[PDB]
RNA sequence: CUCGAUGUCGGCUCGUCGCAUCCUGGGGCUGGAGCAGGUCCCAAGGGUUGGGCUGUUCGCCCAUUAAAGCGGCACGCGAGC
RNA sequence: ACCGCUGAAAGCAUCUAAGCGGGAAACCUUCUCCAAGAUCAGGUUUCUCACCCACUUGGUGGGAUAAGGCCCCCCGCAGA
């Protein structure tokens, strides 16, 4: 959640977008990535944001 | 506009006034005081003036205190105290090295005298708080001066803070209000104050003009 | 194993929050999170991460009038009948920084580590603070859109 | 139906608008005022005062009348100041003009003196008749009420301080 | 000022108002004025 | 709940709290002329006596007082009497 | 508590919804006392302001001092 909000997105929508993109990276490895490779975490954020639907409230 | 002076309690006597009434007076030796320091708002946050009183041998004063006195350029004294003025400092009516004497008061005025009451040692409840004690007969068993109950029951299962009990008594700082200055003797520098002054003979006493009058 | 912060790993920064019109609860939550370090991915509940927080203009915080008139602040001295109450209005008249500090401290975890965490909090009533030697970057409350 | 009415302007010497604030001048002094945010005060073709507000809202309709009446009272006072005529009833009851203050004799041991506040003028016409004048209606009314409550109500004999021509209650008593 | 949980006008001149969150009845007759409490 | 024990009235001593206020403080109304009252509202800072009779609490009475309030705390308080 | 001034919604009225007053032994300052263990451990001042040895050279172990203090000693109306 800390890393996601650093990249300007909520944990809610980050998880939903990763599920939509079909990325099955674990939460443990997601946190490890967040601490170790911030650039990789940012790339994952862009992927999830793209996979998110156009309007999440419909 | 508070005035103040340090002095020594010399003891009690009696005198007669113009209406031929006896006046019990306490004689206070409001000795000559030196200031040695001024507390300014811009430098300390409050207004006050130090007062030095009491002849002492220079051999008996350690180096730090000697340096403090040297900075103000006065001879060391025994006692040192501050007279807390009001916020209206006015930065005047007091110069370092000024001498105060007993003529800052006048006959018929009113003063406040503060001192340290005499020590009473470890004191019981009857003496310290005026407890009634228990009876001396009619069956009372070894409770003639004992406090009795000190609480309730399971509600509450404790003793409250500040409950009156036996302990050390006296040696407190005490101030007495609205004491009439019967007469000020300028030659010997004493004040004849009507009433009782806290402490023992020879104790240090601070005299101030009464706030309430 | 998951990362566990070591001694010397943590880094601290200085933040200055202007409370000129922020709601008291909002400002308190933001300051508490900043102090604890929940904004960092290296956060660990047993480690005092987090940054120094300076609050200025504490007298200008936003409180409703009925709250100023009716919200009580209680204290017990320990003596019988030792309960003393003041309104938030009087508290803001006298020590405005204390209202903010009490709000922030009510939001930290109730343990020993919070005692060391809250040492990084400085609240001032005016618009000036003495810590110009440090360079507190301004911080504004933001909400990430969901 | 008050508030949807323009305010006539006899003089309006220095009518200004600055962020829901107005000031006026004329034959008397100037008094500033700040208008409520939802209500807007505007100038018209002949410089009249009109109060506007977003319609259909309780808090706005309530404030409309207040905003109109405040400015109308302001201009009325600047044109001619408000004056209150009050009389004194009771045996031996009377008032005296002592410089700028008024001295009252209402049966008390001590002499009752009322100090004139700033901007308020006192005038005594008769021993039992006197006037309070001024520009601000609220201040004039407050001082008039203060002077009126100098004595407790007396329904049996009517002694006290009264406004001119008002009816106080009466009781038979004995 | 009569103080009862039920306040209602007694004569035709009594006005029922609500001020400072208080339901109270005012009238020219002083013995008619009441407030809720 | 307590039976391999939770000491039961009254009194003394020490208290503390509530306000449903006895006095003192502030008011409204009055079938309040004044003095005095009645009733209702606000108010718990302080104060609120000594005896006779009874194991008593309670109660009656005597003499005062500004007043002689009502209750909770194991019907407060027996490793305090 | 209560008594008001200005005043609409509700063309009037209204102590009130904007606003502004008075108002008690109750509350807060003011008088007395405690108080920086207030670990946010404060302020104003003044004095010393100085050495030597060892070592793995360490915000390391020792030793000798300054200012100052304590113990010992003669006492107290200070006191278990
Ligand atoms: Mg005895
Ligand atoms: Mg016995
Ligand atoms: Mg025995
Ligand atoms: Mg015996
Ligand atoms: Mg308990
Ligand atoms: Mg049993
Ligand atoms: Mg058995
Ligand atoms: Mg057992
Ligand atoms: Mg009791
Ligand atoms: Mg009550
Ligand atoms: Mg009669
Ligand atoms: Mg009455
Ligand atoms: Mg009381
Ligand atoms: Mg008080
Ligand atoms: Mg019992
Ligand atoms: Mg026993
Ligand atoms: Mg017991
Ligand atoms: Mg018993
Ligand atoms: Mg026991
Ligand atoms: Mg009116
Ligand atoms: Zn009526």
PDB file of N, CA and C in Angstrom, chain B residues 61-95:
ATOM      1  N   UNK B  61      32.949  32.484  51.613  1.00  0.00           N
ATOM      2  CA  UNK B  61      32.183  32.470  50.373  1.00  0.00           C
ATOM      3  C   UNK B  61      33.038  31.849  49.281  1.00  0.00           C
ATOM      4  N   UNK B  62      32.483  30.864  48.582  1.00  0.00           N
ATOM      5  CA  UNK B  62      33.249  30.138  47.587  1.00  0.00           C
ATOM      6  C   UNK B  62      33.478  30.995  46.344  1.00  0.00           C
ATOM      7  N   UNK B  63      34.283  30.461  45.429  1.00  0.00           N
ATOM      8  CA  UNK B  63      34.663  31.216  44.239  1.00  0.00           C
ATOM      9  C   UNK B  63      33.495  31.593  43.337  1.00  0.00           C
ATOM     10  N   UNK B  64      32.541  30.711  43.022  1.00  0.00           N
ATOM     11  CA  UNK B  64      31.439  31.138  42.142  1.00  0.00           C
ATOM     12  C   UNK B  64      30.635  32.301  42.693  1.00  0.00           C
ATOM     13  N   UNK B  65      30.199  32.211  43.948  1.00  0.00           N
ATOM     14  CA  UNK B  65      29.431  33.294  44.546  1.00  0.00           C
ATOM     15  C   UNK B  65      30.252  34.571  44.612  1.00  0.00           C
ATOM     16  N   UNK B  66      31.541  34.440  44.916  1.00  0.00           N
ATOM     17  CA  UNK B  66      32.418  35.600  44.925  1.00  0.00           C
ATOM     18  C   UNK B  66      32.465  36.256  43.555  1.00  0.00           C
ATOM     19  N   UNK B  67      32.536  35.453  42.495  1.00  0.00           N
ATOM     20  CA  UNK B  67      32.522  36.014  41.155  1.00  0.00           C
ATOM     21  C   UNK B  67      31.214  36.708  40.832  1.00  0.00           C
ATOM     22  N   UNK B  68      30.097  36.126  41.268  1.00  0.00           N
ATOM     23  CA  UNK B  68      28.807  36.774  41.057  1.00  0.00           C
ATOM     24  C   UNK B  68      28.780  38.142  41.717  1.00  0.00           C
ATOM     25  N   UNK B  69      29.262  38.225  42.954  1.00  0.00           N
ATOM     26  CA  UNK B  69      29.283  39.512  43.639  1.00  0.00           C
ATOM     27  C   UNK B  69      30.264  40.472  42.979  1.00  0.00           C
ATOM     28  N   UNK B  70      31.399  39.957  42.512  1.00  0.00           N
ATOM     29  CA  UNK B  70      32.396  40.797  41.864  1.00  0.00           C
ATOM     30  C   UNK B  70      31.851  41.425  40.593  1.00  0.00           C
ATOM     31  N   UNK B  71      31.062  40.670  39.831  1.00  0.00           N
ATOM     32  CA  UNK B  71      30.482  41.213  38.609  1.00  0.00           C
ATOM     33  C   UNK B  71      29.638  42.444  38.902  1.00  0.00           C
ATOM     34  N   UNK B  72      28.839  42.397  39.962  1.00  0.00           N
ATOM     35  CA  UNK B  72      28.030  43.538  40.364  1.00  0.00           C
ATOM     36  C   UNK B  72      28.808  44.562  41.175  1.00  0.00           C
ATOM     37  N   UNK B  73      30.045  44.257  41.553  1.00  0.00           N
ATOM     38  CA  UNK B  73      30.889  45.215  42.237  1.00  0.00           C
ATOM     39  C   UNK B  73      30.415  45.591  43.624  1.00  0.00           C
ATOM     40  N   UNK B  74      29.948  44.606  44.388  1.00  0.00           N
ATOM     41  CA  UNK B  74      29.565  44.804  45.778  1.00  0.00           C
ATOM     42  C   UNK B  74      30.242  43.726  46.612  1.00  0.00           C
ATOM     43  N   UNK B  75      30.327  43.978  47.906  1.00  0.00           N
ATOM     44  CA  UNK B  75      30.911  42.993  48.805  1.00  0.00           C
ATOM     45  C   UNK B  75      29.927  41.853  49.035  1.00  0.00           C
ATOM     46  N   UNK B  76      30.399  40.617  49.164  1.00  0.00           N
ATOM     47  CA  UNK B  76      29.479  39.494  49.378  1.00  0.00           C
ATOM     48  C   UNK B  76      28.696  39.650  50.671  1.00  0.00           C
ATOM     49  N   UNK B  77      27.443  39.221  50.638  1.00  0.00           N
ATOM     50  CA  UNK B  77      26.603  39.174  51.820  1.00  0.00           C
ATOM     51  C   UNK B  77      26.241  37.726  52.124  1.00  0.00           C
ATOM     52  N   UNK B  78      25.521  37.523  53.222  1.00  0.00           N
ATOM     53  CA  UNK B  78      25.123  36.173  53.594  1.00  0.00           C
ATOM     54  C   UNK B  78      23.924  35.706  52.780  1.00  0.00           C
ATOM     55  N   UNK B  79      22.863  36.498  52.752  1.00  0.00           N
ATOM     56  CA  UNK B  79      21.641  36.106  52.071  1.00  0.00           C
ATOM     57  C   UNK B  79      21.473  36.855  50.759  1.00  0.00           C
ATOM     58  N   UNK B  80      20.726  36.240  49.849  1.00  0.00           N
ATOM     59  CA  UNK B  80      20.475  36.785  48.523  1.00  0.00           C
ATOM     60  C   UNK B  80      19.064  36.389  48.126  1.00  0.00           C
ATOM     61  N   UNK B  81      18.239  37.367  47.769  1.00  0.00           N
ATOM     62  CA  UNK B  81      16.852  37.076  47.444  1.00  0.00           C
ATOM     63  C   UNK B  81      16.339  38.101  46.449  1.00  0.00           C
ATOM     64  N   UNK B  82      15.279  37.725  45.747  1.00  0.00           N
ATOM     65  CA  UNK B  82      14.696  38.547  44.702  1.00  0.00           C
ATOM     66  C   UNK B  82      13.329  39.047  45.134  1.00  0.00           C
ATOM     67  N   UNK B  83      13.085  40.330  44.917  1.00  0.00           N
ATOM     68  CA  UNK B  83      11.776  40.920  45.138  1.00  0.00           C
ATOM     69  C   UNK B  83      11.054  40.999  43.804  1.00  0.00           C
ATOM     70  N   UNK B  84      10.023  40.182  43.647  1.00  0.00           N
ATOM     71  CA  UNK B  84       9.307  40.074  42.386  1.00  0.00           C
ATOM     72  C   UNK B  84       8.409  41.289  42.208  1.00  0.00           C
ATOM     73  N   UNK B  85       8.804  42.193  41.322  1.00  0.00           N
ATOM     74  CA  UNK B  85       8.004  43.369  41.037  1.00  0.00           C
ATOM     75  C   UNK B  85       6.843  42.987  40.127  1.00  0.00           C
ATOM     76  N   UNK B  86       6.088  43.979  39.682  1.00  0.00           N
ATOM     77  CA  UNK B  86       5.006  43.736  38.752  1.00  0.00           C
ATOM     78  C   UNK B  86       5.567  43.857  37.338  1.00  0.00           C
ATOM     79  N   UNK B  87       4.747  43.513  36.346  1.00  0.00           N
ATOM     80  CA  UNK B  87       5.186  43.568  34.960  1.00  0.00           C
ATOM     81  C   UNK B  87       5.639  44.963  34.556  1.00  0.00           C
ATOM     82  N   UNK B  88       5.145  46.001  35.230  1.00  0.00           N
ATOM     83  CA  UNK B  88       5.597  47.358  34.958  1.00  0.00           C
ATOM     84  C   UNK B  88       6.995  47.545  35.529  1.00  0.00           C
ATOM     85  N   UNK B  89       7.998  47.045  34.808  1.00  0.00           N
ATOM     86  CA  UNK B  89       9.372  47.119  35.287  1.00  0.00           C
ATOM     87  C   UNK B  89       9.821  48.563  35.461  1.00  0.00           C
ATOM     88  N   UNK B  90       9.577  49.391  34.443  1.00  0.00           N
ATOM     89  CA  UNK B  90       9.976  50.794  34.394  1.00  0.00           C
ATOM     90  C   UNK B  90      11.494  50.929  34.322  1.00  0.00           C
ATOM     91  N   UNK B  91      12.206  49.804  34.431  1.00  0.00           N
ATOM     92  CA  UNK B  91      13.662  49.741  34.327  1.00  0.00           C
ATOM     93  C   UNK B  91      14.365  50.805  35.162  1.00  0.00           C
ATOM     94  N   UNK B  92      13.770  51.201  36.279  1.00  0.00           N
ATOM     95  CA  UNK B  92      14.339  52.267  37.091  1.00  0.00           C
ATOM     96  C   UNK B  92      13.975  52.003  38.546  1.00  0.00           C
ATOM     97  N   UNK B  93      14.074  53.047  39.372  1.00  0.00           N
ATOM     98  CA  UNK B  93      13.886  53.051  40.822  1.00  0.00           C
ATOM     99  C   UNK B  93      14.779  52.022  41.504  1.00  0.00           C
ATOM    100  N   UNK B  94      15.725  51.448  40.763  1.00  0.00           N
ATOM    101  CA  UNK B  94      16.656  50.465  41.299  1.00  0.00           C
ATOM    102  C   UNK B  94      17.893  50.442  40.419  1.00  0.00           C
ATOM    103  N   UNK B  95      19.021  50.883  40.961  1.00  0.00           N
ATOM    104  CA  UNK B  95      20.301  50.811  40.275  1.00  0.00           C
ATOM    105  C   UNK B  95      21.175  49.814  41.012  1.00  0.00           C
TER     106      UNK B  95
END
